[PDB]
Structure 1
Amino acid sequence: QDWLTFQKKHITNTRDVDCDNIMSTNLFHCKDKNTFIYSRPEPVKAICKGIIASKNVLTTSEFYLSDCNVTSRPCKYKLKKSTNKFCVTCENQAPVHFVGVGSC
């Protein structure tokens, strides 16, 4: 019925994560914090290429990150946008856990 509503209904992609709306979904259930990587999966998965054992691996390059951080208002967030290295648990050559931004 309008452009912004069409966008929300039918367009899957913005670097600008809508924190209040995505953090309130079933998957995030209003938790205090989540980091989103604006990237294709393949370059993220490549971080763990050739790693079989469970290991924490910092990226050798930076990615575009959206951090949703809760305010004093329940399930209301502020968005921080940055580029940085991040750390993942690699297992069977795939990321299984996001460990942290800038450092393991």
Structure 2
Amino acid sequence: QDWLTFQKKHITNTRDVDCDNIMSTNLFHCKDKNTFIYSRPEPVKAICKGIIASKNVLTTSEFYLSDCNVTSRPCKYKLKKSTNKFCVTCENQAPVHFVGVGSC
């Protein structure tokens, strides 16, 4: 919905996200999956530069991705690290929603 929420939900300052800890907090409420982007915020915000009306945009660059993926045991996760492009919804020159990995 907005840039601050997007960062809280998707930007990490470690690749080695502690899935079992972070996913169990109220922000993520033990949901099934979440993709974290290992990056300082500013190159992520730059994905949306110049884009005013809501639009989905795939990154030009590859990013380091850390996914928390739920196992067969509720609220227990595996950390999967990967490198890929990802798709965000840009609005008023900022990412406001994460769409998906690899494609819009």
TM-score interval w.r.t. the shorter chain? 0.7 to 0.9
TM-score by length of 1: 0.86
What percent identity do the matched residue pairs reach? 100
TM-score by length of 2: 0.86
User: How far did residue 31 of structure 1 move?
Assistant: 0.3
Show CA shifts across 1:16-40 (max 9, x none): 0010111011111100000000101
Greater RCO (Cα-Cα under 8 Å, separation 6 or more) = 2
Q: Distance in 2 between matches of 1:101 and 1:85?
A: 6
Counterpart in 2 of 1:101?
A: 101
Secondary structure of the corresponding residue to residue 42 of structure 1: helix
Alignment RMSD: 8.3
Q: Distance in 2 between matches of 1:103 and 1:9?
A: 19
Secondary structure of the corresponding residue to residue 47 of structure 1: helix
Q: Provide runs of 4+ in structure 1 moved above 2 Å.
A: 1-14
Q: Distance in 2 between matches of 1:95 and 1:23?
A: 21
